[PDB]
Ligand binder design. Structure first.
Ligand SMILES: O=c1[nH]c2cc(C(F)(F)F)c(N3CCOCC3)cc2n(CP(=O)(O)O)c1=O
Ligand SMILES: CCCCCCCCCCCCCCCC
Ligand SMILES: CCCCCCCCCCCCCC
Ligand SMILES: CCCCCCCCCC
Ligand SMILES: CCCCCCCCCC
Ligand SMILES: CCCCCCCCC
Ligand SMILES: CCCCCCCC
Lengths: 28, 49, 101, 124, 151, 49, 49
């Protein structure tokens, strides 16, 4: 149902959102 | 939604569409008659395909 | 020697006078010896003129507009719900929040 | 258009901006020690260097799966310098020169993602 | 019935449909005989731009050779679909009772047997097209969802 | 039957099936016109269908 | 020939005639009325309490 180009985009967007949240929760 | 659209209707396409396409993939072994018009035509052929 | 017909048509038997027009006319009346050109083989022509073996086959085909790639828009995922629904959801979202507070 | 490499260049702009704040805070930490407790400024520096090196590790990993090897070459020498920091684990003038180049390198490469991304999106 | 199909105003195609005693072609003739819009074009080029402007609303019925040339040797915004309805054939002529029919007929069959007419056709219809053959390998319709749909 | 196969791709070479006629015979000038009349009448297509 | 063949419309042609139906507020307003009605009822019992 989802092309292989989207599955590779979801994993890196997942880790990207995770590291962004970690960086936001660090400046405080 | 896409997984529901898949199992609802099926659209099976042929793995080939012409002779000039199967001559480049070379994945399906195609055969002809031993002796006849097709063999004699493919023997003396000037076109590259 | 190659020359183009002055009439520029293939021509057939005229309904008023029994005269052949175009290239087939110049052949019957002796004005030409060979007519190498795209000429559909028919009954009325062969009945008066000689034909060779068909050097090209054809047929009445269909021509339709080629469908383009139809690249979907950037916000194509907002299609199942109209623009009025999305805005009404946001206005109902803030309305419920203020009421809850 | 919309390619996997175009999306990788978009996540870099959001992530490289955070790496800019790290190298800037490092200069402020170096400037405070130059003017002059002392363990506080140094321990906070140790907590800041680890995420800066780990985030850049994704830049060398995202482009590896994005087939954009022309950009990976601009980040491999940066990762090789991190190996010297982990292998060994005055110094004030040495660390000062070793930090000003970080701000310039993390900024010149930052403008690449701001332009190399446009070289793929509008080029549909 | 969503797409209206028409042919030349005065040509061999209109005369063929008027004398076609086939149920497949009879219903098509009665539909093209009574229609409010223009289902007959005088010039074949005027009907060509009408198809390009209709954008999937006008299906012009012409010969196979003219359809393949107007698709390849012209800006390819239209394509040919389906097989030939009827069967015709070109041919060079010769005056009735002339000595230039025998050897000429033998030369035509010799050229068609040696694969020469197929080479000349593939050269003037495909090797010299206007838009050419962009992505000759037909891209299969990917059933999976594209990335631009959720971009 | 069982219609397990199908035809794909267009015709590569186009040859014709002609009605034979003896050389010295005078039937060619009739069978040619008759075949052309049957082809123009659309009878061969209906017979094939 | 005179009744079904010479017809303006066709039964076999317009069989499916399926079109992409984009949903709008014309049929979804049923849940918006209950949503506002629930908020008004919740504010009413809150004032009574
Ligand atoms: O002998 C004939 N030779 C023809 C040859 C051609 C072509 F070679 F393809 F140009 C065409 N076209 C095909 C489509 O319409 C435009 C031109 C029509 C021919 N017709 C029908 P007419 O032009 O209406 O007389 C003949 O009768
Ligand atoms: C109020 C403003 C509503 C804007 C909605 C824009 C929708 C555009 C859809 C196609 C986008 C193509 C780039
Ligand atoms: C978007 C980034 C804005 C950065 C603003 C920085 C302001 C710094 C003010 C104090 C400078 C002290 C230098 C010794
Ligand atoms: C169609 C333009 C407006 C889209 C609004 C999307 C809102 C999503 C969250 C309710
Ligand atoms: C694209 C050519 C170089 C590939 C390097 C793979 C490791
Ligand atoms: C949900 C997780 C999907 C992971 C996909 C990894 C590449 C095939
Ligand atoms: C035109 C609609 C804009 C919506 C922005 C996001 C609101 C939550």
């Amino acid at each position: 149902p989802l092309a292989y180009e989207i599955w590779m985009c979801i994993v890196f967007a997942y880790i990207g959102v995770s590291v962004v949240l970690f960086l936001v929760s660090r400046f405080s | 939604a896409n997984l529901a659209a898949f199992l609802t209707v099926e659209r099976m396409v042929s793995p080939i569409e012409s002779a000039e396409d199967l001559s480049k993939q070379t994945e399906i072994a195609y055969g002809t008659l031993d002796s006849g018009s097709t063999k004699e035509f493919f023997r003396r052929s000037k076109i590259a395909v | 020697r190659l020359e183009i017909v002055s009439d520029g048509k293939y021509g057939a038997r005229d309904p008023d006078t029994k005269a052949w027009n175009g290239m087939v006319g110049e052949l019957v009346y002796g004005r030409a010896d060979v007519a190498v050109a795209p000429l559909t083989i028919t009954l009325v022509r062969e009945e008066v003129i000689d034909f060779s073996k068909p050097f090209m086959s054809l047929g009445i085909s269909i021509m339709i507009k080629k469908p383009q790639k139809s690249k979907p828009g950037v916000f194509s995922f907002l299609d199942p719900l109209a623009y009025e629904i999305w805005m009404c959801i946001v206005f109902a979202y803030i309305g419920v929040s203020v009421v809850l507070f | 258009a919309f390619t996997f490499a175009a999306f990788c260049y978009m996540l870099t702009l959001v992530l490289c901006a955070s790496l800019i704040f790290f190298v800037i805070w490092h200069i402020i930490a170096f400037d405070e020690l130059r003017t002059d407790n002392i363990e506080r400024i140094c321990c906070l520096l140790r907590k800041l260097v680890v995420p800066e090196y780990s985030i850049h590790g994704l830049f060398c990993l995202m482009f590896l799966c994005a087939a954009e090897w022309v950009t990976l070459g601009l980040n491999i020498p940066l990762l090789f310098y991190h190996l010297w920091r982990y292998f060994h684990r005055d110094i004030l003038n040495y660390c000062q020169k070793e930090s000003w180049c970080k701000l310039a390198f993390y900024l010149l490469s930052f403008f690449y993602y701001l332009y190399s991304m446009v070289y793929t999106l509008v080029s549909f | 019935t969503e797409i209206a199909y028409g042919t030349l105003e005065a040509g061999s195609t209109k005369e063929f449909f008027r004398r076609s005693k086939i149920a497949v072609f009879e219903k098509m003739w009665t539909y093209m005989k009574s229609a409010e819009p223009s289902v007959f074009v005088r010039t074949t080029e005027e009907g060509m731009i009408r198809v390009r402007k209709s954008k999937g609303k006008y299906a012009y019925l012409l010969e196979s050779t003219m359809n393949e040339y107007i698709e390849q040797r012209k800006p390819c915004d239209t394509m040919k679909v389906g097989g030939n309805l009827d069967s015709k054939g070109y041919g060079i002529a010769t005056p009735k009772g002339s000595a230039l029919r025998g050897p000429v007929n033998l030369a035509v069959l010799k050229l068609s047997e040696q694969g020469v007419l197929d080479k000349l056709k593939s050269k003037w219809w495909y090797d010299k097209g206007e838009c050419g053959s962009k992505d000759s390998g037909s891209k299969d319709k990917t059933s999976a969802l594209s990335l631009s749909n959720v971009a | 039957k069982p219609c397990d196969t199908m035809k794909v791709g267009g015709n590569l070479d186009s040859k014709g099936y002609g009605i034979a006629t003896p050389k010295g015979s005078s039937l060619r000038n009739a069978v040619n016109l008759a075949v052309l009349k049957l082809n123009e009448q659309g009878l061969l297509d209906k017979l094939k269908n | 020939k005179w009744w079904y063949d010479k017809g303006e419309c066709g039964s076999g042609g317009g069989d499916s005639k399926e079109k992409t139906s984009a949903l709008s507020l014309s049929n979804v307003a049923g849940v918006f009325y209950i949503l506002v009605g629930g908020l008004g009822l919740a504010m009413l019992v809150a004032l009574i309490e």
